[PDB]
Amino acid sequence: MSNSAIPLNVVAVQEPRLELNNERTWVVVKGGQQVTYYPFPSTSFSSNQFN
């Protein structure tokens, strides 16, 4: 690593097929209860407008 010109820093990486260890943390996904959809039919529709 420190072979060339200005020396560099070493790091190693495990290939994808194997870690096999790293720290595996269970992650509970949470979002607020009650997601609801409304259909607001336009008041005062026209032929040249929508409101």
Partner 1 sequence: LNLTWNNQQGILSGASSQNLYDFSVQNGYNKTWSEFNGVTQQFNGVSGQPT
The residues that touch partner 1, with contacts defined as CB under 8 A, are 34, 36, 38
Least distance to partner 1, CB of residue 33, Å: 9
Closer to partner 1 at the Cβ: 37 or 45?
Answer: 37
DSSP string, 1-51: -TTSSS---------TT----S----------S-------PPTT--SS---
Closer to partner 1 at the Cβ: 21 or 36?
Answer: 36
Closer to partner 1 at the Cβ: 7 or 41?
Answer: 41
